[PDB]
Amino acid sequence: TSSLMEQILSNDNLNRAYLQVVRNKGAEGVDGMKYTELKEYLAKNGEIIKEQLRIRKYKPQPVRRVERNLGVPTVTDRFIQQAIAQVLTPIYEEQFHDHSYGFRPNRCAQQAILTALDMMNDGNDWIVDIDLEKFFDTVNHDKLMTIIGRTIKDGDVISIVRKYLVSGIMIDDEYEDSIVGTPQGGNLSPLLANIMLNELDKEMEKRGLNFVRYADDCIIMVGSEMSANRVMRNISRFIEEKLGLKVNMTKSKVDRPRGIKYLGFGFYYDTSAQQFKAKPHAK
Amino acid sequence: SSLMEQILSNDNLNRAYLQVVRNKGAEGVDGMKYTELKEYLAKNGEIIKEQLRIRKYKPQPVRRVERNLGVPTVTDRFIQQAIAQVLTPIYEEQFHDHSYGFRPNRCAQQAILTALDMMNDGNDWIVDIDLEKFFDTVNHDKLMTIIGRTIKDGDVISIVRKYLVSGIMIDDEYEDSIVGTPQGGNLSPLLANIMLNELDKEMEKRGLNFVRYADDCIIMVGSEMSANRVMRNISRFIEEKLGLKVNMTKSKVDRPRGIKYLGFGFYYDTSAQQFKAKPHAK
Ligand SMILES: [K+]
Ligand SMILES: [K+]
C-alpha cells in the first residue's frame, strides 16, 4: 500500500468514480456545481486535479451545511472521495468484522436486525445500547490517521484523506428513520468511521461479545442484567479511553428488546412464533 | 448418493433438526412443541427415514392459524428443512440476481435498493402486478413438472408433491415490514421460487428491469405506454404459461409514490434529487 495513489488516479478507477457520483445525484456543494455539470468540468480540469493530488496541492472545499443536518461536499470532492474509497474499500473489507453492516458493499440494516434477532432468540435478550456522539464531530484526526496508517503506507493517500476530514465530511444518518436509499455526502466518511470503529469490533470479539454494528450505532446482546451492566461500563470505558470517542451517558441504556430502537426498528415478542421479531417503530 | 439418500444423511438431518429447533414456531396439528422434536426423533427417526425411502411417509395437513398461516407439524418442518437444505444449493445457481425472497443472504431491503437504483436511472413508471396467493392457485402438476427438469429422483418428487397437498404456503408478514423468522416456510418459499424463476428468465429475456420477492414483483419501465405494454405482456405470460392468477383490480401502472412494496412506500427526496423509500403507513 505504498503506491495506492496511482491506482486511485487510474483512468479506469476515475471513470468508475465519475459514473457512481453522477448516479448518486445529490445536492450541490458550496460551489453550486450540479452533478450534471461534473462531466464538462472534469473534461477541462480533470488532469489538473490529478496533478494537484499527486503533489498534495489539491484543496478540498468545505462541505455545504444543508438542513437533520448534512454536510454536502462539492460534486468534484464527492468524485475524488469516491475514487479514494473504491481503492481503500477492498483493502479494508478483508479486515472488517462480519457483524458490521453499515455503509458496506452487499450489506444493509435489515441484515443487522436479523443477526441481532438470532442472538436475542438464543437467550441473549439483555441489550446494551451504547449511544455515541456524532463520529466526525468528536473523532481525533491524528488518532484516526494513525489507525489508517497501520494499513495504508502511501503518504499521498494519507495526506488527502486528512484534508477531507478537515473539509467536514460526515455521515448521513437518515437510516435512523428507516429510510432506504443513497446517502448524501457519504462516499468516504462512512468507510473512515468503519476503520476506526473496527477497533471496537475487534475488542468486542476479543471479549466474546454478541454484537451488531451499523456505522457508529451498535447494540450488544448479553444473557443477564448483571452482565449487561458490566459490559455497558467496560465498553463505554474502552470507547472513551482507547478510541477517544464520546459516550452519551443518559441515552445509553441497558434494556430488554421491547425498549430498544435500532436502525428505525423496534422489537417485540411474537407469542405465536414464540420468538422476538422486529418492525419499524413509531416515529 | 441419490438425492434422497443425501437428504436422509446424518449431517443433513442433524442440521435440519437443529435449524427447526432454532426457528421455534407454533405447533402443527399434532400439538407437538418444537422443544419435543429432539426426543421424538431420537425414538422415531429411523422409522421416519424408512418410510421416506419407500414413499410411505404421510405428511400431516398444515394447521390454520390467524393474516392466515398454515403451520406444519414440527416433524414436517424438520423433513421440509431437510429437503430444502439439499435442493437450495442446486437451485441457487439457477436463480436470478434480482430475486430476493426467502433466499440465503438476501432480504427485502436489498430488493428495495435495487428497485430504487432502477427508478433513479429514469425507469419510474412501475408495473405492479398482483398475483393471487401462490399456493392457493398453483397447479401442482405444472409445478412438479418444472421441478422435474432438475430433480430426477422420484422419491424426492414424491415427498415434495405430498407436502404441496398438505397445504404448505408462504408467511407474508414481510408485507407489514416485519423482520424475523417466517412460520412454516422451510420448503414452500423455495418451491414458489422454482416456478417463479420461469418468470424471472422471461423478464430477463425481454430486457426488463425488475425485482421480485416470492410472488411479489415490481417492474421498472421508462414510460407509461411501455409500462402498460409490459403489464399486458407479462400478465399474459403469468396466466397462460405459469397458470397463475393475476388480480386485475389490484394490478396497476403507477409512479413510485403510488407503490407499496414489501412494506415500503417511495418518495422523491428533493434535496438528494432522487427517489428513496421508507415504511409506509399501516
Ligand atoms: K446504539
Ligand atoms: K407486485
Q: What is the DSSP string of A76-143?
A: HHHHHHHHHHHHHHHHHHTTS-TTB-TT-TT--HHHHHHHHHHHHHTT--EEEEE-B--HHHH--HHH
Distance (Å) of CA A63 to CA A52, A66, A70, A171, A190 = 20, 9, 9, 12, 15
Question: How many Cβ atoms from other residues are within 10 Å of residue A242's Cβ?
Answer: 12
Nearest by CB to A275, which of B107, B180, B272?
B180
Q: Which of B247, B268, B272, B248 is nearest to B258 (CA)?
A: B268
Residue of B nearest to A276 (CA): B180
Nearest by CB to A275, which of B24, B273, B276?
B24
Contacts with A8 (C-beta within 8 Å, 6 or more apart), sequence order: A14, A53, A83, A84, A86, A87, A157
Q: Are B261 and B112 in contact (CB under 8 A)?
A: yes
What number of CA atoms fall less than 13 Å from residue B14's CA on the CB side? 3
Q: Which residues of A touch B111 (CB under 8 A)?
A: none
Q: Which residues surround ligand 2, an ion (CB under 5 A)?
A: B 128, 216
Contacts with B40 (C-beta within 8 Å, 6 or more apart), sequence order: B32, B75
Contacts with B278 (C-beta within 8 Å, 6 or more apart), sequence order: A177, A178, A179, A180, B264, B265, B267
Q: Which of B184, B215, B181 is nearest to B84 (CA)?
A: B184
Q: Which residues pair with B276 in a beta bridge?
A: B267
Q: Are B277 and A26 an interchain contact pair (Cβ–Cβ within 8 Å)?
A: no
Q: Are B184 and B25 in contact (CB under 8 A)?
A: yes
Contacts with B236 (C-beta within 8 Å, 6 or more apart), sequence order: none
Query: What is the phi/psi pair of residue B265, to 5°?
Result: -110, 165
SS3 A249: coil
Contacts with A5 (C-beta within 8 Å, 6 or more apart), sequence order: A53, A54, A154, A156, A157
Tell me the C-alpha distance between B176 and B114, whole Å: 20
Please provide the DSSP assignment of A10-53 as one string: SHHHHHHHHHHHHHH-----TT---GGGHHHHHHHHHHHHHHHH
SS3 A156: helix
Q: Which residues of A touch B34 (CB under 8 A)?
A: 274
Cell numbers standing for residue B44: 422415531
A274 touches chain B (CB under 8 A): yes
Q: State the distance between the two ends of chain B, measured CA to CA, in whole angstroms.
A: 50
Q: Which residues of A touch B175 (CB under 8 A)?
A: none
Q: Are B24 and A66 an interchain contact pair (Cβ–Cβ within 8 Å)?
A: no
Angle between the B108-120 and A109-121 helix axes, to the nearest 10 degrees? 170
Tell me the C-alpha distance between B84 and B81, whole Å: 5
Mutation target for B interface from A110, A177, A180: give the one with most B CBs within 10 A.
A180
Q: What does the domain layout of chain B look like in residue ranges?
A: 1-95+134-185, 96-133+186-282
Nearest CA distance, B2 vs chain A (angstrom): 33
Q: Are B200 and B211 in contact (CB under 8 A)?
A: no
Identity (one letter) of the amino acid at A102?
G
SS3 A204: helix
Tell me the C-alpha distance between A240 and A252, whole Å: 13
Identity (one letter) of the amino acid at B120?
N
Tell me the C-alpha distance between A269 and A279, whole Å: 11
DSSP state at residue A153: -
Question: How many Cβ atoms from other residues are within 10 Å of residue B272's Cβ?
Answer: 22
CA of B19 to the centre of ligand 1 (A): 29
B44 touches chain A (CB under 8 A): no
Q: Are A72 and A29 in contact (CB under 8 A)?
A: yes
Q: Are A49 and A80 in contact (CB under 8 A)?
A: yes
Q: Are B178 and A273 an interchain contact pair (Cβ–Cβ within 8 Å)?
A: no
Ordered strands of the B260-261 beta sheet: B260-261, B264-269, B274-279
Tell me the C-alpha distance between A104 and A190, whole Å: 9
Of the listed ligands, the closest to the CA of A215 is 1
Tell me the C-alpha distance between B73 and A228, whole Å: 37
Query: What is the phi/psi pair of residue B130, to 5°?
Result: -110, 120
Secondary element (H or E) of residue A254: strand A253-255
Q: Are B282 and B260 in contact (CB under 8 A)?
A: no
CA of A110 to the centre of ligand 1 (A): 15
E-strand stretches of chain B? 63-65, 69-71, 125-128, 209-213, 216-221, 252-254, 260-261, 264-269, 274-279
SS3 B68: coil
Q: Which of A76, A93, A69, A196 is nearest to A145 (CA)?
A: A196
Nearest by CB to B271, which of A24, A27, A121?
A27
Identity (one letter) of the amino acid at B239?
E
Nearest by CB to A274, which of B25, B107, B276?
B25
